Amino acid sequence: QMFVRHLFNRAGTVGENVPDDLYIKGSGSTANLASSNYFPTPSGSMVTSDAQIFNKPYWLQRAQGHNNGICWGNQLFVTVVDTTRSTNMSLCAAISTSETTYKNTNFKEYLRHGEEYDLQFIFQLC
Amino acid sequence: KVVSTDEYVARTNIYYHAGTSRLLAVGHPYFPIKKPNNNKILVPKVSGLQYRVFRIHLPDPNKFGFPDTSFYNPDTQRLVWACVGVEVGRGQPLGVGISGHPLLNKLDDTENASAYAANAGVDNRECISMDYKQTQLCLIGCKPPIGEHWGKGSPCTQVAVQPGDCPPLELINTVIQDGDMVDTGFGAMDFTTLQANKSEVPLDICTSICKYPDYIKMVSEPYGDSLFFYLRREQMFVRHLFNRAGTVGENVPDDLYIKGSGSTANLASSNYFPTPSGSMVTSDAQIFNKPYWLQRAQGHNNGICWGNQLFVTVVDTTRSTNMSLCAAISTSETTYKNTNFKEYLRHGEEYDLQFIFQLCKITLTADVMTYIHSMNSTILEDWNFGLQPPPGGTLEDTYRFVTSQAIACQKHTPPAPKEDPLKKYTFWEVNLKEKFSADLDQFPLGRKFLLQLGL
Amino acid sequence: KVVSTDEYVARTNIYYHAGTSRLLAVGHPYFPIKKPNNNKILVPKVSGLQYRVFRIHLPDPNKFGFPDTSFYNPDTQRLVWACVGVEVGRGQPLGVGISGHPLLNKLDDTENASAYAANAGVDNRECISMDYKQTQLCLIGCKPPIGEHWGKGSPCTQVAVQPGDCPPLELINTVIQDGDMVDTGFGAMDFTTLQANKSEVPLDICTSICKYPDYIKMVSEPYGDSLFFYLRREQMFVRHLFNRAGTVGENVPDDLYIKGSGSTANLASSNYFPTPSGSMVTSDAQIFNKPYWLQRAQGHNNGICWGNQLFVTVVDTTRSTNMSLCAAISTSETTYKNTNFKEYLRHGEEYDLQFIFQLCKITLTADVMTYIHSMNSTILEDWNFGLQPPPGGTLEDTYRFVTSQAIACQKHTPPAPKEDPLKKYTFWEVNLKEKFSADLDQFPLGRKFLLQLGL
């Protein structure tokens, strides 16, 4: 799920020009056309518990596919994607435990993100 | 008096599956790219706001070669295709587009002002954009969909309109062709004819016409061939509020305010307008990639793909995101040169259809025939009734029959192919004549459907 | 003591369908367009905020010519129309309008300020707009709807109001006429009389009165003829917060703050006000284009279209989008000339109704009659009781009867047509006298309804 945060114009040079048959020539300031190549700012709205999809069990009893959970070659493929926990922590370390004044140059800023996972399954012999 | 197909149409225990491989279309989100001098479209306009219309072609049942042919009598009935299951495939990842106009007739933010607005110079339009109303929809019928919208209706022979004078209105019905524009949040009308301005709405729609399914009429249809199944999902709200620049067409009756004074003395445009905004899209919102069972229909026609034809009409903004791609002109300069890169805009659409059809026979008696004919001549005309031996008929007759019948196998194959009675219009053609199958088990829809019904 | 119609009203196994072809109305979203000198409305005000009221006229059952007439006895009862099914057709594509006022009494953004506001000069009003509260609703009855609102109530004989002095209030009931204004998010009142200012709200409502269904009273109704069915759907929130410019009517009790100082020394207006905003509209939100079965009703009257009359009252903002259309004055200049284009604003509304009616008979005995009369004279008066032969009556009587009866077929047709007891008011007239049918199968609603009930 997502929506439009903002709307912007792509800077650069016209790749394909706007057919004149779709407007009236400018004049003065307007005389010259502005880029028509716009683009939006995506925004995944707020996350919620009720929204959650993991930390829940999935029973693969029936499947619309011909293969019914037959881990051939004793192999398996779990593919996941979850933005819901994307918060990255900005951690900063100082270079000197002195100066009693905030020195922009006294601190190195870093960015880190972590992910916690754990899987579990049930298998039927066949 | 009309009646449900079920009356005259017989249902078989035969089912078949058919579906496109994978449809794809890519082009420009706002307009086609053609040679400046020429006209041949090098690149076509392609936006999530184009009405996707499919003319699904089916193989003639009667003409089809089946394994067993016992189930029915060709000397008393004809076969017809009946759809019962459909699934619309949407392949692109969910996302939103965004359109606008470099010189939209924007005046000023009417949403909130600190002090009175400036004065109208000339060419105050600006470059803006937005997210049209979020809309999902689809419908099917053996006949094509009919849209409604607004347009300049012919007037009366009186005051020969003074240039600039406001035009008259008229609701107009029209066959929703493939690629046409869906309401964006500005209504259904011929912007071209109604807005001489040519800068009241984003380009992609500036010179076009936004259409809306005249649901009503469609249903009012007696036979109800237009469409037997459908579902809509639209939603939107006010992003911004603006004033339309220009000159007063109709003035504000003084009896509705107190004269200004100084700066206020002169009235500002009252002709405001809003910025549409289709809110966020969601999975749970999704309407496609789901199967639709057309078992029952409130219409008289129950999925009787007459003429072995079909009409799937879809609309989905949910995946409108267009990608801005840029190419450089020189792999040199270690400094960003605005002039070193050409910017482009492209949008793609992923589609795939699939259906389930039940075979059907129709005993053709007088009344029957008649009704059909009356309903729609073609149907029969299209069919072919090989001459047959007259029952107990006079030897003379029978004889003649033979003769004629005999001289009917002279191998002469001069069958002048008919002409598309809708050649006029144009939409996405979908030939399926070679995609029918029985073992639906080999297909998702099949499986699903199958199991679903059970037997 | 009152009682459910079911008591005296007999229900038949007869059903009929009727519905408008397709109603359409187009005009100006804020006010009517009439000749400056004259008054004849060249163009009418047409907004999604106008209360749509329909006076649906039905053919007299008793006067109606039926195939079989056995089912009842005209010598003992009268026939009445009973609605049982209704569907409201909304044809325009979902969308939103937007209104405002070039000189609304806006002072300043009270939502958030960096430093204290300036000083009140004169004519600080501005040009703003907004999206009124989103509202869907409809109701029906054999009697017209009654709205409530605020107004200048007559005062008491005391302090002869000092000009400017605040006016007294009074809740007022009124018959919701067609076109009237629905609450926009500013309440129900006579802005005209209550706001001399003439710039406190968007024009389209500036000089009008916003009304609200006095649901309560309507239901409190004993017979409950006003309305037997309805449903409402309103929602809205605060877009912005503003200060009302002008002069303090009532001053702020000092015991509620500390005196200012310098810039602050002088108090700013405390009379704030908000910007209404009907949030986004959605399909799932939709309330029309759906059928309504009036099988049971908590009211005493159960869809007894008395006088073969009906009242469908609707309100739907969901399709308010008005289109700004512009025409140029000269097809020359290759430069945008603000003065070369006339701007206009238009809005259209698509409607279509449909219903199902059950025929009903009513054995008329004393008590019966009485009750009815007491309930509402007219009903009977309106009906006609052709003289009949007195049972076992003295030959003399019988004789006289004959005579009179005989001299009653003198072909003299001088029946002075009655007068609309509500001529005063005016709403959308809907004649159906020639739209009744039996084979509902030929109609959607029919089918639906039919199948729905089953039998």
Q: What are the structural domains of chain C?
A: 1-455 (2.60.175.20)
d(CA B379, CA B362): 12
* Sign of the four-CA dihedral A57, A63, A64, A66: positive
User: Counting runs of H as helices and runs of E as strands, what totals does chain A give?
Assistant: 0, 5
- For B376-432, strand residue ranges (E) read 428-431
Closest-CA residue to C84 (of C7, C22, C14): C14
Q: Are C10 and C360 in contact (CB under 8 A)?
A: yes
Q: Are C41 and C356 in contact (CB under 8 A)?
A: no
d(CA A111, CA A90): 5
Q: Are C93 and B183 in contact (CB under 8 A)?
A: yes
Single-letter residue type at C7: E
Contacts A27 to C, Cβ<8 Å: 335-336
Min distance B290 CA to chain C CA atoms (Å): 18
Query: How many angstroms separate the Cα of B409 from the Cα of each of B381, B386, B416, B417, C307?
Result: 21, 11, 17, 19, 73
Q: Which of A6, A9, A14, A16 to mutate to test the interface with B (most CBs of B within 10 A)?
A: A16
What letters, b where the CB count within 10 A reaches 16 and e where it falls short, cover C117-143?
Answer: eeeeeebbbbbbbbbbbbbbbbbbbbb
What letters, b where the CB count within 10 A reaches 16 and e where it falls short, cover C160-177?
Answer: eeeeeeeeeeeebebbbb
Spell out which chain A residues touch chain B, with contact meaning CB-CB distance below 8 angstroms.
1-4, 7, 9-16, 18-19, 21-24, 26-30, 33-40, 42-43, 45, 64-66
Min distance B321 CA to chain C CA atoms (Å): 21
Q: Are B126 and B273 in contact (CB under 8 A)?
A: no
Closest-CA residue to C342 (of B449, B248, A19): B248
Tokens 């190419």 map to which residue?
B327
Give the N- to C-terminal CA distance of chain B in Å, as an integer. Answer: 35
Angle at B158 between CA B155 and CA B160, to 5 degrees: 80
Neighbouring CB atoms inside 10 A of C303's CB total 27
Q: Which residues contact A35 (CB under 8 A, 6 or more apart)?
A: A9, A10, A11, A12, A14, B102, B127, B343
d(CA B144, CA B309): 10
Q: Which of B108, B186, B197 to mutate to test the interface with C (most CBs of C within 10 A)?
A: B197
Secondary structure of residue B306 in the 3-state scheme: helix
Q: Decide if B235 and C281 are in contact by the 8 Å CB cutoff.
A: yes
Q: Which of B176, B256, B267, B281 to mutate to test the interface with C (most CBs of C within 10 A)?
A: B256
Give all chains having 3 or more CB-to-CB distances under 8 Å with chain C: A, B
Q: Which of C17, C107, C127 to mutate to test the interface with B (most CBs of B within 10 A)?
A: C127
d(CA B115, CA C121): 12
Q: Are C155 and C161 in contact (CB under 8 A)?
A: yes
Contacts C336 to A, Cβ<8 Å: 24-27, 30
Secondary structure of residue B18 in the 3-state scheme: strand
d(CA C241, CA C274): 4
Element (H, E) at C373: helix C366-375
Q: Search chain B and give the residue with CA nearest A51.
A: B284
Closest-CA residue to C10 (of C365, C356, C291, C298): C365
Q: Which of B191, B238, B287 to mutate to test the interface with C (most CBs of C within 10 A)?
A: B238
* Tokens describing residue C227: 């309305």
Burial class (CB in 10 A: 0-12, 13-18, 19+), B449: buried
* Tokens describing residue C240: 């912005």
Contacts 24+ apart (CB under 8 A), C74-77: C75/C388, C76/C363, C76/C364, C77/C10, C77/C361, C77/C362, C77/C363, C77/C364
d(CA C165, CA C189): 18
Neighbouring CB atoms inside 10 A of C70's CB total 6
Min distance A30 CA to chain C CA atoms (Å): 9
d(CA C347, CA C356): 31
* Sign of the four-CA dihedral B170, B174, B179, B185: positive
What does C67-99 look like in DSSP terms, one character per residue?
S--TTS-TTTEEEEEEEEEEEEEE-SPSB---E
Contacts A25 to C, Cβ<8 Å: 334-336
Single-letter residue type at B135: T
Q: Decide if B276 and C96 are in contact by the 8 Å CB cutoff.
A: yes
Q: Decide if A30 and C336 are in contact by the 8 Å CB cutoff.
A: yes
Contacts B441 to A, Cβ<8 Å: 66
d(CA B254, CA B238): 29
Q: Which residues contact A83 (CB under 8 A, 6 or more apart)?
A: A44, A47
d(CA C65, CA C55): 23
What letters, b where the CB count within 10 A reaches 16 and e where it falls short, cover B252-279?
Answer: beeebbeebeeebeebbbbbbbbbbbbb
Q: Are C413 and C324 in contact (CB under 8 A)?
A: no
Neighbouring CB atoms inside 10 A of B314's CB total 21
Neighbouring CB atoms inside 10 A of B420's CB total 10
Contacts B123 to A, Cβ<8 Å: 26-30
Q: Are B378 and B418 in contact (CB under 8 A)?
A: no
Stated length of chain A: 126
- The backbone torsions φ and ψ at residue B220, rounded to the nearest 5 degrees and listed phi first, read -50, -25
CB pairs under 8 A between B and C: 271
Spell out which chain C residues touch chain A, with contact meaning CB-CB distance below 8 angstroms.
334-336
Radius of gyration of chain B from its Cα atoms, rounded to whole angstroms: 29
Q: Are C301 and C289 in contact (CB under 8 A)?
A: no
**Residue C88: beta bridge partners?**
C353
d(CA A13, CA B361): 62
Q: Are A41 and A5 in contact (CB under 8 A)?
A: yes
Q: Which residues contact B25 (CB under 8 A, 6 or more apart)?
A: B44, B46, B348, B349, B351
Contacts A30 to C, Cβ<8 Å: 336
**DSSP type of residue A105:** G
d(CA C148, CA C219): 13
Element (H, E) at B323: strand B323-328
d(CA B179, CA B156): 34
* Sign of the four-CA dihedral C222, C225, C230, C236: negative
Q: Which of A10, A28, A30 sits opposite B324 (nearest CB)?
A: A10
Contacts 24+ apart (CB under 8 A), C381-385: C382/C307, C382/C418, C383/C62, C383/C78, C384/C62
Contacts A25 to B, Cβ<8 Å: none
d(CA B422, CA B214): 19
Q: Decide if C344 and B261 are in contact by the 8 Å CB cutoff.
A: no
Contacts B345 to A, Cβ<8 Å: 10, 15-16, 37
Q: Search chain B and give the residue with CA nearest A13.
A: B342
Closest-CA residue to C214 (of C176, C163, C256, C180): C176
Secondary structure of residue C442 in the 3-state scheme: helix
* Tokens describing residue B277: 């905004």
Burial class (CB in 10 A: 0-12, 13-18, 19+), A33: middle
Closest-CA residue to B274 (of C337, C132, C207, C137): C132
Q: Are C123 and B264 in contact (CB under 8 A)?
A: yes
CB pairs under 8 A between A and C: 11
* Tokens describing residue A40: 């939006």
- The backbone torsions φ and ψ at residue C406, rounded to the nearest 5 degrees and listed phi first, read -60, -55
Q: Which residues contact C41 (CB under 8 A, 6 or more apart)?
A: C32, C33, C34
Query: How many angstroms separate the Cα of C107 from the Cα of each of C104, C126, C175?
Result: 9, 8, 36
d(CA A100, CA B376): 92
Give the N- to C-terminal CA distance of chain A in Å, as an integer. Answer: 40
Q: Are B307 and B55 in contact (CB under 8 A)?
A: no
d(CA C190, CA C172): 10
d(CA C14, CA C356): 10
**DSSP type of residue B437:** B
Q: Decide if B253 and C31 are in contact by the 8 Å CB cutoff.
A: yes
- Torsional class of B203: left (φ above 0), alpha (ψ -120 to 50), beta (otherwise): alpha
Q: Which residues contact B35 (CB under 8 A, 6 or more apart)?
A: B42
Q: Decide if B326 and A12 are in contact by the 8 Å CB cutoff.
A: yes
d(CA C437, CA C445): 12
Closest-CA residue to C136 (of C237, C205, C231, C24): C231
Pairing of strands C237-244, C106-109: antiparallel
Pairing of strands B210-213, B181-182: parallel
Q: Which of C239, C336, C350 sits opposite B122 (nearest CB)?
A: C336
Q: Are C6 and C296 in contact (CB under 8 A)?
A: no
Burial class (CB in 10 A: 0-12, 13-18, 19+), A5: exposed
Single-letter residue type at C136: Q
Instruction: Give start and end residues of each alpha helix (H) in B119-261.
Output: 191-194, 203-206, 215-220
Spell out which chain A residues touch chain C, with contact meaning CB-CB distance below 8 angstroms.
24-27, 30
Contacts A45 to C, Cβ<8 Å: none
Closest-CA residue to B380 (of B371, B368, B365, B369): B369
Secondary structure of residue B354 in the 3-state scheme: strand
Neighbouring CB atoms inside 10 A of C101's CB total 30
Contacts A24 to C, Cβ<8 Å: 334-336
Secondary structure of residue B378 in the 3-state scheme: helix
Give all chains having 3 or more CB-to-CB distances under 8 Å with chain A: B, C
Neighbouring CB atoms inside 10 A of B163's CB total 11
Q: Which of A27, A29, A33, A45 to mutate to test the interface with C (most CBs of C within 10 A)?
A: A27
Contacts C335 to A, Cβ<8 Å: 24-27
Contacts B222 to C, Cβ<8 Å: 442
d(CA B437, CA C4): 61
**DSSP type of residue C449:** H
Angle at B256 between CA B253 and CA B262, to 5 degrees: 90
What does A61-80 look like in DSSP terms, one character per residue?
S--SSSS-S--GGG------
d(CA A91, CA A109): 6
d(CA B79, CA B309): 13
Three-state secondary structure readout of C1-46? CCCCHHHCCEEEEEEEEEECCCEEEEEECCCCEECCCCCCEEECEC
Element (H, E) at C397: helix C395-406
Radius of gyration of chain A from its Cα atoms, rounded to whole angstroms: 27
Q: Decide if C339 and B216 are in contact by the 8 Å CB cutoff.
A: no
Contacts B298 to C, Cβ<8 Å: 444, 447-448, 451
Contacts B94 to A, Cβ<8 Å: 1-2
Q: Decide if C127 and B117 are in contact by the 8 Å CB cutoff.
A: yes
* Tokens describing residue A35: 């880029």
Neighbouring CB atoms inside 10 A of B60's CB total 16
Tokens 């079965």 map to which residue?
C293
Q: Which of B103, B279, B441 sits opposite A26 (nearest CB)?
A: B103
